[PDB]
Design an enzyme around this catalytic site. Structure first.
Site, short mmCIF file in Angstrom:
data_model
loop_
_atom_site.label_atom_id
_atom_site.label_comp_id
_atom_site.label_asym_id
_atom_site.label_seq_id
_atom_site.Cartn_x
_atom_site.Cartn_y
_atom_site.Cartn_z
N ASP A 119 35.54 37.82 45.77
CA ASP A 119 36.88 37.87 45.22
C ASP A 119 36.84 38.42 43.78
OD1 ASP A 119 39.72 37.33 44.97
OD2 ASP A 119 39.22 35.54 43.68
N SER A 120 38.00 38.78 43.24
CA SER A 120 38.05 39.27 41.90
C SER A 120 37.85 38.17 40.82
CB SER A 120 39.39 40.00 41.64
OG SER A 120 40.51 39.11 41.87
#
Ligand code: CL
Ligand code: CL
Lengths: 268, 266
Positions: A12-13
């Site tokens: 994920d970011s």
């Protein structure tokens, strides 16, 4: 030893993927989690598909090198940009979070009027209406970009008065619709869910797709004969391209895991 | 080119799984085969159950299916592994999905399983549940009267209320917070079971999770159809087509369906 246990990877970011982790901890308590959030390069929201895919592959390669048995793309923009390419090229199972949230939404709706909250890039991809209408061509889907939400979450102010103000200002348009179900179409957004729910009131079902994503993880591990079967001590590992303390402060709040191992890494 | 999702069952119970597929996957055609002439399977030899299940499988594979659901607890327990191994389409049963659903629903990890004597004696649900969470507590209870109550149309009547109350009283002495309906007939009793168990117990219709897994697997393999235009569902039975149609047109809200009589095995 930990040699028998192979981890489920999550990418994920930033902290958003933790909303999927939380449901994996619940539904698959024997499974080890390796998590990587690319905090240094968050937000992915306003980035181009080509770049998102490139970054997503960098994260994937990092976890594949650490031996994971399955990969969850716990990030909506990353799913839209690169799921099929990564699923195709890897040998392990690979899922994203758009299809699970679509299924959950359709199960929750009473009037088939569904709202989607997400980033600029998720909204522009049309991934949600495409998935939703792919399951049920009669559903109505209206989406709203919420570029401020990730900033409020990543800064750890998701319980504050500022969070309450940003939610109210971004979500007011939904009150002009008859939408009865809203998908949190960014994995960061469930950190704001209490505020969103208070704003929208009891007539709107707010969907955190983490539960459905974690059930899909369980289903695929069982299907492929990949469930962990060992008594080895679980050793989860969290990796970030940003600061470990701020990640830990958020992660320990959301997961209730006081003794978490969080390390800084460099990608790209 | 449009292919069906196949469903096989010893009888009509599996139509409760179909009902959830119709809801969650409105674009998909279903082919359902109920082997009512040889039901129940539960008391038969595991080898025999497996043989019959393969005959149904072969029948639907010949008709053009892209995925198979063994919509029967007994048959899932006896032949899922072998059928999945041998076929080139995705194959699932209802046990693992109901187990997943329970583990999602529970808050205290104390789970009940209701089923036929065969199903409960198979230990298929405890095996599935403990393979996901070795700490879960599982109380299994055979409920031999329920299939009859459902098939006779008594499942809303005072009869059902009494049979449910009588059958499930032992569970009142546990702290279970979740009950799996581990027979596909049993969702017809769900409201009466919920009333008896009360608001602190989640009652699981495993057809809902099953349907979700069909959706998920079709997506995984890029096999989700985009329209219900030209859907042509087919229902097949080895027993009476009329008694089957009477049940199915009700449970599925499908007044105009056609039910075909078929011959299997011998
Ligand atoms: Cl954005
Ligand atoms: Cl299964």
């Amino acid at each position: 030893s930990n040699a028998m246990k192979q981890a489920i990877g999550f990418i994920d970011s930033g902290v958003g993927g933790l909303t999927v982790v939380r449901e994996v901890l619940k539904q698959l308590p024997h499974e080890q989690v390796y998590y990587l959030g690319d905090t240094a390069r968050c937000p992915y929201g306003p980035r181009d598909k080509e770049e998102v895919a490139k970054f997503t592959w960098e994260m994937t390669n990092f976890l594949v090198d650490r031996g994971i048995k399955m990969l969850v793309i716990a990030c909506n923009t990353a799913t839209a940009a690169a799921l099929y390419d990564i699923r195709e090229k890897l040998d392990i199972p690979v899922i994203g979070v758009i299809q699970p949230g679509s299924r959950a939404a359709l199960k929750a709706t009473r009037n088939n009027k569904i709202g989607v909250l997400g980033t600029l890039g998720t909204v522009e991809s049309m991934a949600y209406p495409t998935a939703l209408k792919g399951l049920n061509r009669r559903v109505e889907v209206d989406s709203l970009a919420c570029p401020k939400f990730v900033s409020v979450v990543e800064s750890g102010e998701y319980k504050s008065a500022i969070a309450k103000k940003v939610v109210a200002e971004s979500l007011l348009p939904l009150k002009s619709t008859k939408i009865d179900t809203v998908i949190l179409g960014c994995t960061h957004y469930p950190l704001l869910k209490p505020i969103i729910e208070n704003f929208m009131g009891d007539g709107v079902a707010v969907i955190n797709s983490g539960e459905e994503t974690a059930s899909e993880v369980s289903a695929l591990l069982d299907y492929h004969n990949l469930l962990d079967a060992t008594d080895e001590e679980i050793e989860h590992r969290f990796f970030t391209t940003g600061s470990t303390q701020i990640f830990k402060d958020i992660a320990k709040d959301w997961l209730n895991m006081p003794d978490m191992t969080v390390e800084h890494i460099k990608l790209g």
